[PDB]
Amino acid sequence: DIQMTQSPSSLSASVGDRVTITCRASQDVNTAVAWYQQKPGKAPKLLIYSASFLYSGVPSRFSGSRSGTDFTLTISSLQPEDFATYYCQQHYTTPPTFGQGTKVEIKRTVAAPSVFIFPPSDEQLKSGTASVVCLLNNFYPREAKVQWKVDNALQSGNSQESVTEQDSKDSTYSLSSTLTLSKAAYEKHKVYACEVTHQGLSSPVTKSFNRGE
Amino acid sequence: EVQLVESGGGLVQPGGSLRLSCAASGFNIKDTYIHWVRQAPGKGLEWVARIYPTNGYTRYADSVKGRFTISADTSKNTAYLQMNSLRAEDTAVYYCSRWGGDGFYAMDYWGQGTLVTVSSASTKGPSVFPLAPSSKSTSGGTAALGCLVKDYFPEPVTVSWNSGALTSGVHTFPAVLQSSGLYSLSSVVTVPSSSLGTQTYICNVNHKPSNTKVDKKVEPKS
Ligand SMILES: *C(=O)CCCC[C@@H]1SC[C@@H]2NC(=O)N[C@@H]21
């Protein structure tokens, strides 16, 4: 089994920048290498075949080259729609093997998130569980720190985060953090706060509500 | 134009059997090799098997050898993957692809894939709760509201707003698996603060695996 060692695992670059993704075959595979693009929720799309040939419909900014066992995918001018995971593949022998993939995101100017907090609905409390939701809307970069405070006590082990894919229009992200408590714990406490730290914010932003007010 | 269309996926118990199909159009599978390639949630691509339908010769990845059978029927222009002794490790989107043939051994056409989930967990529809817009929403500014889609299994669910009329500013988050083993997600939207109390906001939730359809009105709390 020939292995395809793909680097880097991820990269960030601005619109118009030159992006280089590389793959090292464990042994000679001649030119029997293809490159694929996979966007979220979609099937892989063939970009390059026989190491260096541009496939049908692929923009000219994509190209491939081979030097020995080193294979390189180049995007000469990165575009916002190029946000995707890229995979090399050798098909010199059976089984055909894929590289681990390279996740490509678009670097843009810093944008601070707009922060919102949502209390649990009365209908959910009737079921015995309380979910408190903090929303960070349309920010960049993706990295952010969201901390939950219940009556000024920091929470640990009871919240989960989810992040959207990078927006096609403005290259931003949105993020949710969801705090889960029992109904009894939710009714005992008063102040619910989510504290947000981000590069676009000069100081951390806190959004909070008092239960029942 | 060439197309490949998979079918046959679903939720199946561990140790069970499932047969996937791949119907080819715009070309004849006699002239090509047909492959299955799978992708576990959040992981890379893994080749599974290949067949040359003219003589039926097959090759398999070691991880499925003996348990899976790839086959094809040239008179139906259709290929199959019979999966047996299914394990949770087999949970994945299963893609059909082809080699171009005639000296071309890249995978040029792929289907959209069919999701196979191997689990002993039963189906369950979500509860949908409002994320009510804050009464502190800035007058004349921007407010956020949404729906919390909680405790369902398996994936996927779809969410729309106002039956597709509201698309700008919508963020429907990827689901997270809770410690309970059920999924949860939220869908949010930012709207003008002046619209609260007059414009109606309804999230439309569809969970096909449990035949659950919920429309939930989200309004400011009284
Ligand atoms: C139980 O876990 C301690 C609950 C603390 C609630 C605090 S005490 C001060 C704040 N005012 C109030 O009415 N509740 C808050």
Side-chain angles (χ1 to χ4, degrees):
Chain A
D1 295 12
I2 305 179
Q3 295 84 18
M4 296 295 267
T5 302
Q6 187 165 347
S7 179
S9 74
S10 66
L11 65 89
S12 191
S14 302
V15 175
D17 282 358
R18 187 178 182 93
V19 165
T20 288
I21 301 167
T22 68
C23 173
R24 171 81 69 79
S26 63
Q27 74 181 63
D28 178 60
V29 296
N30 187 246
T31 60
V33 162
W35 289 93
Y36 302 88
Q37 178 193 67
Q38 189 179 31
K39 294 177 183 186
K42 306 293 187 167
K45 171 202 191 184
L46 174 63
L47 301 173
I48 305 288
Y49 66 98
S50 293
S52 65
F53 292 88
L54 188 71
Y55 187 59
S56 168
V58 181
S60 54
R61 58 179 178 275
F62 294 89
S63 63
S65 57
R66 171 221 178 170
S67 180
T69 55
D70 279 339
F71 296 81
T72 298
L73 178 65
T74 299
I75 312 175
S76 61
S77 182
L78 187 66
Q79 301 299 143
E81 60 271 28
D82 296 342
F83 167 83
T85 301
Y86 294 83
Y87 295 95
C88 55
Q89 179 201 53
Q90 67 81 25
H91 47 83
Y92 190 61
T93 63
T94 300
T97 52
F98 294 99
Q100 289 193 313
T102 297
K103 292 161 71 171
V104 174
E105 69 128 20
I106 312 313
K107 185 200 262 54
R108 57 148 288 160
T109 59
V110 176
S114 304
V115 184
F116 304 87
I117 191 171
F118 300 99
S121 64
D122 287 344
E123 33 267 72
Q124 187 190 15
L125 288 176
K126 302 170 50 182
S127 80
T129 308
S131 298
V132 195
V133 175
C134 188
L135 166 67
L136 282 63
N137 209 46
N138 301 340
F139 62 96
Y140 187 88
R142 167 211 237 259
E143 289 74 32
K145 186 174 76 179
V146 175
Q147 292 196 301
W148 283 103
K149 291 179 184 166
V150 177
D151 288 320
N152 254 326
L154 168 66
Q155 300 301 293
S156 69
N158 48 5
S159 60
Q160 295 185 282
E161 293 186 349
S162 178
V163 191
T164 59
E165 302 284 352
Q166 194 169 28
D167 185 73
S168 55
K169 183 178 178 177
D170 61 6
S171 298
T172 65
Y173 297 87
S174 293
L175 179 152
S176 69
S177 182
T178 300
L179 177 72
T180 303
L181 307 168
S182 70
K183 176 193 193 279
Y186 174 74
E187 299 195 324
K188 181 176 182 322
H189 292 282
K190 174 181 176 184
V191 184
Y192 292 82
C194 65
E195 174 191 282
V196 174
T197 302
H198 188 263
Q199 177 184 350
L201 304 169
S202 315
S203 256
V205 168
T206 298
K207 295 298 176 186
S208 68
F209 66 88
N210 300 328
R211 170 182 53 82
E213 297 171 20
Chain B
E1 189 192 5
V2 170
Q3 77 179 11
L4 297 175
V5 180
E6 304 91 339
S7 57
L11 177 60
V12 56
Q13 291 276 333
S17 293
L18 193 63
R19 197 183 75 158
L20 310 184
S21 305
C22 170
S25 301
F27 77 107
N28 295 327
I29 65 172
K30 284 184 164 172
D31 301 314
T32 64
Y33 291 82
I34 303 301
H35 305 261
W36 291 93
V37 178
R38 69 182 177 184
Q39 182 167 42
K43 307 284 199 196
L45 304 163
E46 175 189 25
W47 175 85
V48 176
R50 94 177 183 209
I51 185 162
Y52 196 47
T54 43
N55 58 15
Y57 288 5
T58 60
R59 299 291 307 266
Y60 297 90
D62 287 341
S63 57
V64 309
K65 184 78 117 181
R67 302 187 295 124
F68 291 10
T69 301
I70 189 177
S71 61
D73 185 337
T74 59
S75 73
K76 296 180 179 57
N77 219 38
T78 297
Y80 308 97
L81 188 64
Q82 178 68 49
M83 307 182 296
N84 303 298
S85 293
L86 278 163
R87 313 160 180 162
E89 289 79 351
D90 299 318
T91 294
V93 174
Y94 283 76
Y95 298 104
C96 185
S97 72
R98 71 166 201 180
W99 276 345
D102 180 66
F104 188 86
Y105 294 112
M107 298 174 175
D108 55 347
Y109 285 92
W110 300 62
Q112 280 301 326
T114 185
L115 175 67
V116 174
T117 304
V118 185
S119 174
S120 60
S122 297
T123 64
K124 185 187 176 301
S127 300
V128 185
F129 304 113
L131 298 168
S134 160
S135 50
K136 309 172 201 276
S137 301
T138 73
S139 170
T142 299
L145 57 97
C147 280
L148 168 63
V149 180
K150 192 172 160 60
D151 292 338
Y152 66 87
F153 187 85
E155 288 268 59
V157 297
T158 67
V159 185
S160 68
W161 284 91
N162 294 345
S163 306
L166 177 54
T167 53
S168 176
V170 172
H171 294 300
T172 297
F173 287 94
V176 299
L177 191 59
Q178 304 170 103
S179 56
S180 61
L182 301 171
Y183 291 95
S184 180
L185 64 77
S186 287
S187 182
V188 301
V189 59
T190 50
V191 301
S193 297
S194 55
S195 73
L196 308 174
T198 56
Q199 167 81 229
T200 295
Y201 294 105
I202 298 164
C203 68
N204 324 111
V205 179
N206 224 40
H207 184 234
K208 299 269 192 74
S210 71
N211 197 43
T212 300
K213 190 181 198 308
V214 173
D215 297 309
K216 193 60 164 197
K217 177 167 181 187
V218 187
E219 54 190 352
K221 190 166 173 181
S222 183

Short mmCIF file of all heavy atoms in Angstrom, two decimals, chain A residues 36-73:
data_model
loop_
_atom_site.label_atom_id
_atom_site.label_comp_id
_atom_site.label_asym_id
_atom_site.label_seq_id
_atom_site.Cartn_x
_atom_site.Cartn_y
_atom_site.Cartn_z
N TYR A 36 -8.39 16.43 -5.72
CA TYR A 36 -9.83 16.62 -5.57
C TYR A 36 -10.12 17.76 -4.61
O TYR A 36 -9.36 18.04 -3.68
CB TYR A 36 -10.52 15.34 -5.04
CG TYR A 36 -10.31 14.13 -5.91
CD1 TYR A 36 -9.20 13.31 -5.72
CD2 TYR A 36 -11.20 13.81 -6.94
CE1 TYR A 36 -8.99 12.21 -6.52
CE2 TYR A 36 -11.00 12.71 -7.74
CZ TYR A 36 -9.89 11.91 -7.52
OH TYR A 36 -9.68 10.81 -8.31
N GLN A 37 -11.25 18.42 -4.85
CA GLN A 37 -11.78 19.46 -3.99
C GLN A 37 -13.09 18.97 -3.39
O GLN A 37 -13.92 18.41 -4.10
CB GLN A 37 -12.04 20.73 -4.81
CG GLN A 37 -12.64 21.88 -4.03
CD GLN A 37 -13.16 22.97 -4.95
OE1 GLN A 37 -14.12 22.76 -5.70
NE2 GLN A 37 -12.53 24.14 -4.92
N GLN A 38 -13.28 19.16 -2.08
CA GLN A 38 -14.54 18.76 -1.47
C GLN A 38 -15.09 19.89 -0.62
O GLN A 38 -14.51 20.25 0.42
CB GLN A 38 -14.41 17.48 -0.64
CG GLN A 38 -15.79 16.98 -0.21
CD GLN A 38 -15.75 15.71 0.59
OE1 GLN A 38 -14.79 15.48 1.32
NE2 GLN A 38 -16.83 14.92 0.52
N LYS A 39 -16.23 20.42 -1.03
CA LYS A 39 -16.88 21.46 -0.26
C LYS A 39 -17.84 20.83 0.74
O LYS A 39 -18.25 19.68 0.59
CB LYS A 39 -17.61 22.42 -1.20
CG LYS A 39 -16.62 23.19 -2.08
CD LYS A 39 -17.30 24.11 -3.08
CE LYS A 39 -16.27 24.80 -3.97
NZ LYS A 39 -16.87 25.82 -4.89
N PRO A 40 -18.16 21.54 1.82
CA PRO A 40 -19.04 20.97 2.85
C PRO A 40 -20.36 20.47 2.29
O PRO A 40 -21.05 21.18 1.56
CB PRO A 40 -19.25 22.14 3.82
CG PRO A 40 -18.02 22.99 3.65
CD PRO A 40 -17.65 22.87 2.20
N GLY A 41 -20.73 19.24 2.66
CA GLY A 41 -21.98 18.64 2.24
C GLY A 41 -22.02 18.16 0.80
O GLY A 41 -23.09 17.73 0.34
N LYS A 42 -20.89 18.15 0.10
CA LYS A 42 -20.84 17.81 -1.32
C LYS A 42 -19.87 16.67 -1.59
O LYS A 42 -18.94 16.40 -0.82
CB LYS A 42 -20.41 19.04 -2.18
CG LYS A 42 -21.25 20.30 -1.99
CD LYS A 42 -22.66 20.10 -2.50
CE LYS A 42 -23.46 21.41 -2.47
NZ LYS A 42 -24.74 21.30 -3.24
N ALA A 43 -20.05 16.04 -2.76
CA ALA A 43 -19.11 15.02 -3.21
C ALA A 43 -17.80 15.65 -3.65
O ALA A 43 -17.75 16.81 -4.06
CB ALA A 43 -19.71 14.24 -4.39
N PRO A 44 -16.71 14.88 -3.60
CA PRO A 44 -15.44 15.36 -4.16
C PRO A 44 -15.58 15.68 -5.64
O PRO A 44 -16.35 15.06 -6.36
CB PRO A 44 -14.48 14.18 -3.92
CG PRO A 44 -15.09 13.40 -2.79
CD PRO A 44 -16.58 13.55 -2.97
N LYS A 45 -14.80 16.66 -6.07
CA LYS A 45 -14.77 17.12 -7.46
C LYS A 45 -13.34 17.01 -7.97
O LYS A 45 -12.41 17.49 -7.31
CB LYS A 45 -15.26 18.56 -7.54
CG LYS A 45 -15.08 19.22 -8.91
CD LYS A 45 -15.08 20.74 -8.78
CE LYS A 45 -15.17 21.44 -10.14
NZ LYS A 45 -15.08 22.93 -10.02
N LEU A 46 -13.16 16.37 -9.12
CA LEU A 46 -11.83 16.20 -9.68
C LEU A 46 -11.30 17.53 -10.22
O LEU A 46 -11.98 18.23 -10.99
CB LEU A 46 -11.87 15.15 -10.79
CG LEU A 46 -10.59 14.92 -11.60
CD1 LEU A 46 -9.46 14.41 -10.71
CD2 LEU A 46 -10.87 13.97 -12.76
N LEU A 47 -10.08 17.90 -9.82
CA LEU A 47 -9.43 19.13 -10.25
C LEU A 47 -8.33 18.89 -11.26
O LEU A 47 -8.22 19.60 -12.26
CB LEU A 47 -8.83 19.88 -9.06
CG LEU A 47 -9.76 20.33 -7.93
CD1 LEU A 47 -8.92 20.89 -6.78
CD2 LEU A 47 -10.75 21.38 -8.42
N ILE A 48 -7.45 17.93 -10.96
CA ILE A 48 -6.22 17.67 -11.71
C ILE A 48 -6.10 16.17 -11.90
O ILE A 48 -6.31 15.40 -10.96
CB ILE A 48 -4.98 18.21 -10.95
CG1 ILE A 48 -5.13 19.69 -10.62
CG2 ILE A 48 -3.70 17.94 -11.77
CD1 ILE A 48 -5.00 20.65 -11.82
N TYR A 49 -5.75 15.74 -13.11
CA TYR A 49 -5.50 14.33 -13.36
C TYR A 49 -4.12 14.15 -13.97
O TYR A 49 -3.54 15.09 -14.52
CB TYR A 49 -6.59 13.71 -14.26
CG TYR A 49 -6.65 14.23 -15.69
CD1 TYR A 49 -6.03 13.54 -16.73
CD2 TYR A 49 -7.35 15.39 -16.00
CE1 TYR A 49 -6.10 14.00 -18.04
CE2 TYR A 49 -7.43 15.86 -17.30
CZ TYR A 49 -6.81 15.16 -18.31
OH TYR A 49 -6.89 15.64 -19.60
N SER A 50 -3.59 12.94 -13.83
CA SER A 50 -2.23 12.62 -14.27
C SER A 50 -1.24 13.68 -13.82
O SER A 50 -0.41 14.15 -14.60
CB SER A 50 -2.16 12.47 -15.79
OG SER A 50 -2.88 11.34 -16.22
N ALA A 51 -1.38 14.10 -12.55
CA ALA A 51 -0.47 14.98 -11.83
C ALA A 51 -0.54 16.44 -12.26
O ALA A 51 -0.43 17.34 -11.41
CB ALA A 51 0.98 14.49 -11.95
N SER A 52 -0.71 16.72 -13.56
CA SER A 52 -0.56 18.09 -14.03
C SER A 52 -1.63 18.58 -15.00
O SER A 52 -1.49 19.70 -15.50
CB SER A 52 0.81 18.25 -14.71
OG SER A 52 0.87 17.44 -15.88
N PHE A 53 -2.66 17.80 -15.29
CA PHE A 53 -3.62 18.17 -16.33
C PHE A 53 -4.90 18.70 -15.69
O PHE A 53 -5.49 18.04 -14.83
CB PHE A 53 -3.93 16.99 -17.24
CG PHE A 53 -2.76 16.57 -18.09
CD1 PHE A 53 -1.83 15.66 -17.62
CD2 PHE A 53 -2.56 17.13 -19.35
CE1 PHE A 53 -0.75 15.27 -18.39
CE2 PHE A 53 -1.47 16.75 -20.13
CZ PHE A 53 -0.57 15.82 -19.65
N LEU A 54 -5.31 19.90 -16.10
CA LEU A 54 -6.51 20.53 -15.55
C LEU A 54 -7.76 19.82 -16.05
O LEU A 54 -7.96 19.67 -17.26
CB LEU A 54 -6.55 22.00 -15.98
CG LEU A 54 -7.62 22.89 -15.37
CD1 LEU A 54 -7.29 23.14 -13.90
CD2 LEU A 54 -7.72 24.21 -16.14
N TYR A 55 -8.64 19.44 -15.12
CA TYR A 55 -9.84 18.72 -15.51
C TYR A 55 -10.92 19.69 -15.99
O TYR A 55 -10.80 20.91 -15.90
CB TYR A 55 -10.32 17.82 -14.36
CG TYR A 55 -11.46 16.93 -14.79
CD1 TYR A 55 -11.29 16.04 -15.85
CD2 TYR A 55 -12.70 17.01 -14.19
CE1 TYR A 55 -12.33 15.26 -16.30
CE2 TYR A 55 -13.76 16.23 -14.63
CZ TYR A 55 -13.56 15.35 -15.68
OH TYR A 55 -14.61 14.58 -16.13
N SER A 56 -11.98 19.12 -16.56
CA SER A 56 -13.09 19.88 -17.15
C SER A 56 -13.70 20.86 -16.16
O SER A 56 -14.00 20.52 -15.01
CB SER A 56 -14.16 18.91 -17.65
OG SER A 56 -15.36 19.59 -17.97
N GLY A 57 -13.92 22.09 -16.62
CA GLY A 57 -14.61 23.10 -15.86
C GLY A 57 -13.83 23.72 -14.72
O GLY A 57 -14.33 24.66 -14.09
N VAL A 58 -12.63 23.24 -14.45
CA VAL A 58 -11.85 23.76 -13.32
C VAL A 58 -11.21 25.09 -13.74
O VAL A 58 -10.63 25.17 -14.84
CB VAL A 58 -10.80 22.75 -12.90
CG1 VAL A 58 -10.00 23.27 -11.71
CG2 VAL A 58 -11.49 21.44 -12.56
N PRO A 59 -11.31 26.13 -12.91
CA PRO A 59 -10.69 27.42 -13.27
C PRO A 59 -9.19 27.28 -13.46
O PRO A 59 -8.53 26.43 -12.85
CB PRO A 59 -11.02 28.32 -12.07
CG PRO A 59 -12.26 27.72 -11.49
CD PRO A 59 -12.13 26.23 -11.70
N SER A 60 -8.65 28.15 -14.31
CA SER A 60 -7.23 28.12 -14.65
C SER A 60 -6.33 28.44 -13.47
O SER A 60 -5.11 28.25 -13.57
CB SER A 60 -6.96 29.08 -15.81
OG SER A 60 -7.43 30.38 -15.50
N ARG A 61 -6.88 28.93 -12.35
CA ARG A 61 -6.02 29.24 -11.21
C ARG A 61 -5.49 27.98 -10.55
O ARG A 61 -4.52 28.07 -9.79
CB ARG A 61 -6.77 30.11 -10.19
CG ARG A 61 -8.05 29.51 -9.63
CD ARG A 61 -8.68 30.44 -8.60
NE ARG A 61 -9.94 29.93 -8.06
CZ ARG A 61 -11.12 30.10 -8.65
NH1 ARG A 61 -11.21 30.76 -9.80
NH2 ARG A 61 -12.22 29.61 -8.09
N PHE A 62 -6.10 26.83 -10.82
CA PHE A 62 -5.65 25.54 -10.31
C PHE A 62 -4.62 24.93 -11.26
O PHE A 62 -4.81 24.93 -12.48
CB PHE A 62 -6.82 24.59 -10.14
CG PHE A 62 -7.78 25.02 -9.07
CD1 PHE A 62 -8.84 25.87 -9.37
CD2 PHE A 62 -7.61 24.59 -7.77
CE1 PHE A 62 -9.72 26.26 -8.39
CE2 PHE A 62 -8.48 24.99 -6.78
CZ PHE A 62 -9.53 25.82 -7.09
N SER A 63 -3.54 24.40 -10.69
CA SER A 63 -2.57 23.68 -11.50
C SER A 63 -1.90 22.63 -10.62
O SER A 63 -1.89 22.74 -9.39
CB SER A 63 -1.53 24.62 -12.13
OG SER A 63 -0.74 25.29 -11.16
N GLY A 64 -1.35 21.61 -11.26
CA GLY A 64 -0.63 20.57 -10.54
C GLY A 64 0.73 20.32 -11.16
O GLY A 64 0.93 20.49 -12.37
N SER A 65 1.67 19.93 -10.32
CA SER A 65 3.00 19.60 -10.82
C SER A 65 3.55 18.42 -10.03
O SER A 65 3.11 18.12 -8.92
CB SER A 65 3.96 20.79 -10.74
OG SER A 65 4.06 21.27 -9.42
N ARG A 66 4.53 17.75 -10.65
CA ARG A 66 5.19 16.58 -10.11
C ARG A 66 6.69 16.76 -10.18
O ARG A 66 7.22 17.21 -11.21
CB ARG A 66 4.82 15.31 -10.87
CG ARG A 66 5.66 14.12 -10.46
CD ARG A 66 6.08 13.27 -11.64
NE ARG A 66 6.92 12.16 -11.21
CZ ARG A 66 7.28 11.15 -11.99
NH1 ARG A 66 6.88 11.11 -13.25
NH2 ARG A 66 8.04 10.18 -11.50
N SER A 67 7.38 16.43 -9.09
CA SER A 67 8.84 16.32 -9.10
C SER A 67 9.17 15.05 -8.32
O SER A 67 9.10 15.04 -7.09
CB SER A 67 9.50 17.56 -8.50
OG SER A 67 10.91 17.44 -8.53
N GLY A 68 9.51 13.98 -9.04
CA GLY A 68 9.79 12.72 -8.37
C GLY A 68 8.55 12.22 -7.67
O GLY A 68 7.48 12.09 -8.28
N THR A 69 8.67 11.95 -6.38
CA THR A 69 7.54 11.55 -5.55
C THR A 69 6.83 12.73 -4.88
O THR A 69 5.93 12.52 -4.07
CB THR A 69 7.99 10.54 -4.50
OG1 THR A 69 9.07 11.09 -3.73
CG2 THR A 69 8.42 9.21 -5.15
N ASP A 70 7.22 13.96 -5.21
CA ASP A 70 6.60 15.16 -4.65
C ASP A 70 5.55 15.69 -5.63
O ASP A 70 5.88 15.97 -6.79
CB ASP A 70 7.66 16.22 -4.36
CG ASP A 70 8.38 15.98 -3.06
OD1 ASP A 70 7.84 15.26 -2.19
OD2 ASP A 70 9.52 16.44 -2.92
N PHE A 71 4.32 15.86 -5.14
CA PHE A 71 3.20 16.34 -5.94
C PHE A 71 2.66 17.62 -5.32
O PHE A 71 2.50 17.72 -4.09
CB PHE A 71 2.09 15.25 -6.05
CG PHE A 71 2.56 14.03 -6.79
CD1 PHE A 71 3.31 13.06 -6.13
CD2 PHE A 71 2.34 13.89 -8.15
CE1 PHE A 71 3.81 11.95 -6.81
CE2 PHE A 71 2.81 12.78 -8.83
CZ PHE A 71 3.55 11.81 -8.17
N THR A 72 2.37 18.61 -6.16
CA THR A 72 2.00 19.93 -5.67
C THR A 72 0.76 20.43 -6.39
O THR A 72 0.72 20.45 -7.63
CB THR A 72 3.15 20.93 -5.85
OG1 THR A 72 4.27 20.50 -5.07
CG2 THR A 72 2.72 22.32 -5.38
N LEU A 73 -0.24 20.82 -5.61
CA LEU A 73 -1.40 21.56 -6.10
C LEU A 73 -1.19 23.03 -5.79
O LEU A 73 -0.89 23.38 -4.64
CB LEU A 73 -2.69 21.08 -5.43
CG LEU A 73 -4.02 21.76 -5.78
CD1 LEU A 73 -4.38 21.51 -7.23
CD2 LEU A 73 -5.14 21.19 -4.89
#
